[PDB]
Amino acid sequence: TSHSWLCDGRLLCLHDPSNKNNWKIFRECWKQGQPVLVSGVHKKLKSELWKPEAFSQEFGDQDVDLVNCRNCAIISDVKVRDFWDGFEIICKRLRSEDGQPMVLKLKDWPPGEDFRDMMPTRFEDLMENLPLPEYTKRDGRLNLASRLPSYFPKMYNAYGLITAEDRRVGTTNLHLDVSDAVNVMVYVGIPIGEGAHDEEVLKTIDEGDADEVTKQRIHDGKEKPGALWHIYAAKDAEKIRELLRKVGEEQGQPDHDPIHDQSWYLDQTLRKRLYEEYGVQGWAIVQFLGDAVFIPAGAPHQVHNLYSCIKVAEDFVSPEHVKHCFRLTQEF
Ligand SMILES: O=C(O)CNC(=O)C(=O)O
Ligand SMILES: [Cl-]
Ligand SMILES: [Mn+2]
């Protein structure tokens, strides 16, 4: 079974998403609470379905709210095409008071459980090509999601954050989710209208603590980097809460939950600190076009888009983690 290791030997990378024997290798990492990466998923999909132009053409007239990733401001009652038309074409992006193009995220779209209903062909294309299908598919035999009683697909679409100032901002702030999930990068858009940003992208992953083999995927492989993830083991979540309670009190704090508050992005400062002061070393992961990231239930994580990303995630409930999922459901 074709695979290799990233993050200095600590992250499994599976290279063939439809290899039936994948579970054997996957499960050993997964039962220890490690995330897992599967590359090559884009090569299985119907490309034409996962274009920003197609999303604009087909659903542009819908009403939506957006989020400015730099200041968290909400842009109320805008149109879907406003987002998608500026995904790669910088001059088409909605502008702040100062007339500058904004780095934006599309909020709650599609809304509710409307994905399957709103996008049936995309739904079938994703689900027919998810890796580890017995775990990940709604009706997969190791997916307990639908098999349990009432006590246990989402898009993440946003532009990139490339500046030096941007490096301490999250596309999605540190949080955890209650079930297992797989997050697939189905499209990476390289924006035009400000010239090349390759060196900023590279300095951002380096400062994000990415390993040398991850960086060869750019230098040698010439792969298109989508997003930079930091993921932590579910067990390490309290040690991370402890750090953030303290740091927060150093600007005026309650015995509350910083991870649930989803207000923190761990920059290179706090990550060195979390490691030396709490022993906690996470996984710095660059998600390229076609990479599927498996995030264990309750494993805290944050995301920082480098370029413009179309991501689609499927939740599931594995036997290995079904106790976590139960315990996380009650606390949440
Ligand atoms: O992609 C993002 O911005 C955030 N993704 C997730 O939080 C996830 O898959 O759980
Ligand atoms: Cl499987
Ligand atoms: Mn998440």
Atom of ligand 1 nearest to the CA of 171: 3
- Which amino acid belongs to residue 235? K
Q: Residue 277, Cβ neighbours under 10 Å: how many?
A: 13
Say whether 236 sits in a helix, a strand or coil: helix
- Contact in structure between 305 and 169 (CB atoms under 8 Å): no
How far apart are alpha carbons 240 and 236 in whole angstroms?
6
- Tell me how the structure was determined: X-ray
296 CA → ligand 3 middle, Å: 10
Site to probe by mutation for ligand 1, drawn from 295, 307, 308, 309 as the one with most ligand atoms within 8 Å of Cβ, is: 295
Buried b or exposed e, range 182-196, using 16+ CB within 10 angstroms: bbbbbbbbebeeeee
Contacts of 195 (CB under 8 A, 6+ apart): none
- Which amino acid belongs to residue 212? E
- What is the DSSP pairing of strand 63-68 with strand 74-79? antiparallel
Q: Which residue do the tokens 């996962």 mark?
A: 50
- Contact in structure between 325 and 199 (CB atoms under 8 Å): no
From the CA of 143, the nearest ligand is: 2
- Which amino acid belongs to residue 250? E
Q: Give start and end residues of each alpha helix (H) in the chain.
A: 22-31, 52-59, 80-85, 114-118, 120-129, 133-136, 198-207, 212-219, 237-249, 258-261, 268-278, 322-331
- Contact in structure between 319 and 217 (CB atoms under 8 Å): no
Q: Can you read off the two tokens belonging to residue 55?
A: 């999303």
Q: Which residue do the tokens 């409930």 mark?
A: 317
Q: Residue 252, Cβ neighbours under 10 Å: how many?
A: 5
Please provide residue 190's backbone torsions phi and psi, each rounded to the nearest 5 degrees. Answer: -95, 110
- What is the DSSP pairing of strand 11-14 with strand 36-38? parallel
Sign of the dihedral defined by the CA atoms of residues 202, 164, 252, 264, in that order: negative
Sign of the dihedral defined by the CA atoms of residues 256, 259, 262, 265, in that order: positive
- Cα 192 from chain centre: 23
321 CA → ligand 2 middle, Å: 16
Contacts of 277 (CB under 8 A, 6+ apart): 243
CA atoms within a 13 Å half-sphere pointing along the CA-CB vector of 87 = 24
Q: Can you read off the two tokens belonging to residue 176?
A: 């955890």
Resolution in A: 2.2
- Contact in structure between 67 and 104 (CB atoms under 8 Å): yes
- Going by C-alpha positions, the residue among 214, 209, 204 that lies closest to residue 293 is 214
The domain defined by 1-332 folds into: Jelly Rolls (2.60.120)
In the β-sheet with 3-6, what is the strand arrangement from edge to edge? 3-6, 11-14, 36-38, 292-295, 180-189, 308-316, 154-158, 104-106, 63-68, 74-79
∠ at Cα 14 (142, 234), nearest 5°?
60
How far apart are alpha carbons 127 and 306 in whole angstroms?
26
Say whether 296 sits in a helix, a strand or coil: coil
Ion ligand 3 residue ranges (Cβ < 5 Å): 177
Answer whether the bond into residue 225 is a cis peptide, omega within 30°: no
Which protein residue's CA is at the shortest distance from atom 3 of ligand 1? 172
How far apart are alpha carbons 206 and 174 in whole angstroms?
19
∠ at Cα 301 (299, 305), nearest 5°?
150
